[PDB]
Amino acid sequence: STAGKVIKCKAAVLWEEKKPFSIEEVEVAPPKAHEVRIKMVATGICRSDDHVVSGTLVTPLPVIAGHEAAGIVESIGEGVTTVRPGDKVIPLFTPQCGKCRVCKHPEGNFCLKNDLSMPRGTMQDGTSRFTCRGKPIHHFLGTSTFSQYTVVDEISVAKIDAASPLEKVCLIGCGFSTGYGSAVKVAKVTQGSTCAVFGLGGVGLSVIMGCKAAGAARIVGVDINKDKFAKAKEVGATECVNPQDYKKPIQEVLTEMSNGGVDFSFEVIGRLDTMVTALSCCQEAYGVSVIVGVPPDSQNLSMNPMLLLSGRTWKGAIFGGFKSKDSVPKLVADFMAKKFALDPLITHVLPFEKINEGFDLLRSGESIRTILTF
Amino acid sequence: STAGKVIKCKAAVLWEEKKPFSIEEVEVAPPKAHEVRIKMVATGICRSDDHVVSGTLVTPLPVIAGHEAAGIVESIGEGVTTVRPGDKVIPLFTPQCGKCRVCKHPEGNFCLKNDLSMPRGTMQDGTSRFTCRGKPIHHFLGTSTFSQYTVVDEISVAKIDAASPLEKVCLIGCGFSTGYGSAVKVAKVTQGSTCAVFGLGGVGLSVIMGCKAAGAARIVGVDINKDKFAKAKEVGATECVNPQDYKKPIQEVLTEMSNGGVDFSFEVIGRLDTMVTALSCCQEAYGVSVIVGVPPDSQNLSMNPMLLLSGRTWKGAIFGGFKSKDSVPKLVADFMAKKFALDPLITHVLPFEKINEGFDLLRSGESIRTILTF
Ligand SMILES: NC(=O)c1ccc[n+]([C@@H]2O[C@H](COP(=O)([O-])OP(=O)([O-])OC[C@H]3O[C@@H](n4cnc5c(N)[nH+]cnc54)[C@H](O)[C@@H]3O)[C@@H](O)[C@H]2O)c1
Ligand SMILES: NC(=O)c1ccc[n+]([C@@H]2O[C@H](COP(=O)([O-])OP(=O)([O-])OC[C@H]3O[C@@H](n4cnc5c(N)[nH+]cnc54)[C@H](O)[C@@H]3O)[C@@H](O)[C@H]2O)c1
Ligand SMILES: OCc1c(F)c(F)c(F)c(F)c1F
Ligand SMILES: OCc1c(F)c(F)c(F)c(F)c1F
Ligand SMILES: [Zn+2]
Ligand SMILES: [Zn+2]
Ligand SMILES: [Zn+2]
Ligand SMILES: [Zn+2]
Secondary structure, eight states: OOTTSOEEEEEEEBOSTTSOOEEEEEEEOOOOTTEEEEEEEEEEOOHHHHHHHHTSSOOOSSBOOOOEEEEEEEEEOTTOOSOOTTOEEEEOSSOOOSSSHHHHSSSOOOOTTOSSSSOOOSOTTSOOSEEETTEEEBOSTTTOOSBSEEEEEGGGEEEOOTTOOHHHHGGGGTHHHHHHHIIIIIIOOOTTOEEEEEOOSHHHHHHHHHHHHTTOSEEEEEOSOGGGHHHHHHTTOSEEEOGGGOSSOHHHHHHHHTTSOBSEEEEOSOOHHHHHHHHHTBOTTTOEEEEOSOOOTTOOEEEOTHHHHTTOEEEEOSGGGOOHHHHHHHHHHHHHTTSSOOGGGEEEEEEGGGHHHHHHHHHTTOOSEEEEEO | OOTTSOEEEEEEEBOSTTSOOEEEEEEEOOOOTTEEEEEEEEEEOOHHHHHHHHTSSOOOSSBOOOOSEEEEEEEEOTTOOSOOTTOEEEEOSSOOOSSSHHHHSTTOOOOTTOSSSSOOOSOTTSOOSEEETTEEEBOSTTTOOSBSEEEEEGGGEEEOOTTOOHHHHGGGGTHHHHHHHIIIIIIOOOTTOEEEEEOOSHHHHHHHHHHHHTTOSEEEEEOSOGGGHHHHHHHTOSEEEOGGGOSSOHHHHHHHHTTSOBSEEEEOSOOHHHHHHHHHHBOTTTOEEEEOSOOOTTOOEEEOTHHHHTTOEEEEOSGGGOOHHHHHHHHHHHHHTTSSOOGGGEEEEEEGGGHHHHHHHHHTTOOSEEEEEO
């Protein structure tokens, strides 16, 4: 049995920014009240995890990153009611405490218990369950999935279908649900509309899937890497454009393509300039633009508010606007019911020990999602 | 017997920025095809008119300003079908051509024939109906209401109830419809919500009216002029705050007062800093902020897009999101049915000849709306 005991296991520890992950032994404490210790099965490499390494995102170091994953419950702390040992689960990087004003709000999903806005890199109780070489190691978004075992607060875990393929549905922990929800729930893309999607990685392909699902007539993919176009067309893009191919700003190209501006645009990269471009390419009176990409820490954009005064709507979301604990098991159920596909997002499947090579595939432009298997 | 003939009349010509208006004779050409010549009865002084004087709003000079008004049709050009001589009418500074992609969209109102985005200061045909001292004078937003007679394109005028009191209903041509629509149609304020309204002039008072109509529990007026508070309370503010009273920035004050941010915020001033503050003060995950105020020409704001990524929605609108020609007669009908009050906005009445004193009143902070009578 491991229950009630410290587990020594392998994890990918990030000791400082802009360095490879260190794959080594850590000690994982047993779960305290209302906590859940999970044996990881599969975790995806999300660009957000790369932002921690690059310093685009500031979070306390050293850290066990990873937030897109699935695993199997090893043990539960006293008080846990929503999962049990042996359950398949997906950690929730946006929690759902169910009691805060946001949780109670019918649209809101950015639960006030989150560790995103002012990251502490701890459990809800302000402490860490991880040590490495005698030192405490921070958690990341309450999840820390780049470990053979993690401990999460109950509000940061969802039970999923026992028959789920964990090496696919781990994507429901971030990339798929974020893109898909951004289209269907946040933007509320309409039938027959014209959509533009900036950034054709795992998240942007998922936005395309959502736009297609919502019945868009036109879905224009935008990326500087033309290698990403063929997959974007496979999942629903009607045409792809590379800004580098044009003498004019791409907002102008998109406005002409769409005969006056698009219905819905999505920034799915994380650049200040493309957030403004995305806003500008939506139709001035009724367009809607959604920010999905994570921008570099503490940097402001500049824009002209007349872009909004004419009628545009600008919004952003975390995790596709989904209330995380209610939505994740439904999304897995829908996948099992063949309502959407995940295979088009998966380009590479590596063992966990090859985490660094996975991140190099991302950084080189070669991968969409690499799934690491424990 | 004035039909088909040039009319000489007095108008208030603005020859140069930052100068008084010159009340002097102009010649008003007869209407061309699909144009309407209107004998003005009453016109309100809106801060946007003052923006033309200050250079906050750039539009070609010399100009006949004025956009918030009502009058009586003197004559119609060939092909006009929607009004007739002797009809009571409100000029529509935002037109409704009924044919463009915006006019056809269920939620758009910023008709593509507008003269607001890139002002020419002409009629739809690119020419002027106005001469003064033998010199052509520009139109403003297709309305030019600071004249005893104006000529407007048919898509820039609405027939209203023959029994309407024009010295009141002129406010439906801008200030009232704008603020009220901004709350009820653009923001879609909900029952029991907390609203914050930045700027307690005619438009922000109309926003308050709208929020109270929509059933908001709390409506916080924000103004640096505490003289504006009493009227704001009369029309529904539950509490008023002056930023100059506080050591902390007002977004933090509003966030505290609202136990984590308001449901709806409105910028009804026209400053870049208060556009950002107003966004910031709405709840980070599900707050909605609406820009109503008109910013200084060509200036950009600076903001941190993480304010959106958490879940905020930012939008703007012209004329409260109302499709102008459809809405104005319905708004007048509802006023006549006492569905809303216009008297709380009218603080001063003057003859047209005292237009400059009317502007002095607005500039001093003493008036809300001054109505000028021809
Ligand atoms: N809001 C959320 O909850 C949420 C969740 C998941 C991911 N993210 C963010 O979303 C963004 C995309 O994530 P991902 O899909 O995993 O990243 P990714 O796989 O790196 O994809 C980004 C795509 O953007 C492309 N790109 C880079 N620069 C430009 C440019 N100037 N113009 C057009 N394309 C460009 C690039 O070629 C790549 O295909 C990142 O910033 C993530 O941090 C946000
Ligand atoms: N979007 C539209 O269709 C539309 C329509 C009508 C009016 N407008 C604009 O809306 C704004 C309001 O117009 P109005 O109500 O006629 O103007 P107004 O009567 O000048 O009211 C503005 C109010 O803002 C207050 N104010 C000024 N500075 C600050 C500050 N820093 N903090 C708090 N309050 C401050 C000021 O004391 C005044 O009571 C102006 O910019 C207009 O041009 C927009
Ligand atoms: O990809 C999900 C994701 C985000 F959307 C963030 F805003 C963030 F800060 C983060 F760490 C993260 F993982
Ligand atoms: O007050 C209404 C109004 C506006 F909302 C504008 F954006 C504008 F440019 C203008 F001239 C105007 F009069
Ligand atoms: Zn919560
Ligand atoms: Zn992610
Ligand atoms: Zn139109
Ligand atoms: Zn106005």
